[PDB]
Design a binder for this molecule. Structure first.
Ligand SMILES: O=P(O)(O)OC[C@H]1O[C@](O)(CO)[C@@H](O)[C@@H]1O
Ligand SMILES: O=P(O)(O)OC[C@H]1O[C@](O)(CO)[C@@H](O)[C@@H]1O
Lengths: 253, 248
């Protein structure tokens, strides 16, 4: 791309991909921590990435957070009219409703002119209540759909920021801090070496399940996220990262 | 102050206040948007420093949401649905209207996530859980309610009312509906949709209630709902008001 070439993004993408061993790196100009439109541009870039990767039939698992909400906001109908079903990856993870995967999922599906199926399993159910709810045919059906996701679109967060944003019990805050968590993705907190140090108790997709998902797109940027993004990608994730100059330049510095 | 039509409607229906926009929303669809605009202005006049606003679904309150704008006074705004599922399709559900209105207001919101395809047993489990109780408690503390009014038969059909309940609604001569309750011509409850959240007895404690409903087809339904004292502000149109008052 001549735009990417003149802006130095082509080189920055190659350098970032090599540094993090990514399947691919897509970087938009600017720093989303400073300039609001940059998050929207990450959203647009992620949508392009998704459309390039869709097949004839698609089950797209999505996480919540403001970044995947920006992907949803930038989503448009498929000109090839391929079959699109959107589901949340997990149960919502203690996010307020605006930031929950169900909310992002519904928004994305409407914008894509696709269909969606939501997962309603509250995070603080008693053992007994949980046992009954997961046997419910409607819950089983959504969980089974998630098990066959062909695509995952997910955010990445700094550990402390995420622990604070969600309704994280004191007991869990202590564990997150004691084990030096630096980054978070889809209900897992990781340390600087990309090892899992704390897991949010949820339903749906688990970390081991991503290996079976052919197309995974992480969308996260802003200089504040540089260490979080680096830590997450310490492990093989077979993932395309959509990010911005803010995060990428800080990471590479 | 009030026009003679507004003054007459306020007296006739024992309203806290009447706001009547021009035209008949059953003939001129955009008039629903003008009811929405007037309702938003009314809400803004009644806000305190901190607010918990319970809202119903339906196209009229969706129009309120569409016309909502942020508060120039920057008052604290938390929106919630009044009740759980009432059997509306997604576009007409209180949860949908609630999220839309909150976004337009730059406020915050909480949703109720109840019945759906779930068993009674699984349903009861959900309503016991901490976050769900929190929303129910928030609704219980509402400082404002913004609700629609519909014709009973129309509303029963739009929702997916079981045949046995359709028969009961008909047999008891329901004529009007609001927030999941069906009322006869004397404004007495004759059938209720089962749903968590706000109950009819709870409206008395809510300081500001704004009903938004118009169109000549709703004149009978509006009159009947207000046959009992509701201490409510009605935002309506000339279509409804003139027909109700026999002034056209
Ligand atoms: O895009 P944001 O707003 O930074 O949030 C990202 C976070 O949201 C989630 O995707 C959902 O909780 C987290 O896994 C991730 O840490
Ligand atoms: O504004 P509409 O579309 O006529 O619907 C009014 C109806 O919508 C609801 O508020 C929601 O179901 C009902 O209580 C009310 O009767």
């Amino acid at each position: 791309s001549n735009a990417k070439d003149v802006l130095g993004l082509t080189l920055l993408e190659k350098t970032l991909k090599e540094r993090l061993n990514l399947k691919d790196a897509i970087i938009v100009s600017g720093d989303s921590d400073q300039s609001p439109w940059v998050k929207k541009e990450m959203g647009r870039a992620a949508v392009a990435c998704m459309k390039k990767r869709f097949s004839g039939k698609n089950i797209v698992a999505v996480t919540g957070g403001t970044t995947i909400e920006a992907v949803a906001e930038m989503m448009t109908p498929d000109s090839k009219n391929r079959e699109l079903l959107f589901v949340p990856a997990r149960g919502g993870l203690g996010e307020d409703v605006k930031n929950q995967a169900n909310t992002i999922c519904a928004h994305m599906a409407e914008k894509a002119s696709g269909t969606y199926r939501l997962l309603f399993v509250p995070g603080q159910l008693s053992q007994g209540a949980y046992s009954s709810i997961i046997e419910e045919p409607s819950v089983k059906e959504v969980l089974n759909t998630i098990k066959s996701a062909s695509m995952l679109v997910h955010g990445i967060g700094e550990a402390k920021t995420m622990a604070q944003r969600r309704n994280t019990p004191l007991e869990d805050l202590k564990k997150i801090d004691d084990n030096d968590a630096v980054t978070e993705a889809f209900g897992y907190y990781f340390n600087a070496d990309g090892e899992v140090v704390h897991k949010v108790h949820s339903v749906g997709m688990q970390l081991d399940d991503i290996d079976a998902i052919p197309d995974i797109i992480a969308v996260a940027g802003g200089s504040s996220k540089a260490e979080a993004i680096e830590a997450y990608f310490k492990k093989p994730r077979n993932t395309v990262l959509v990010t911005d100059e803010g995060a990428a330049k800080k990471l590479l510095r």
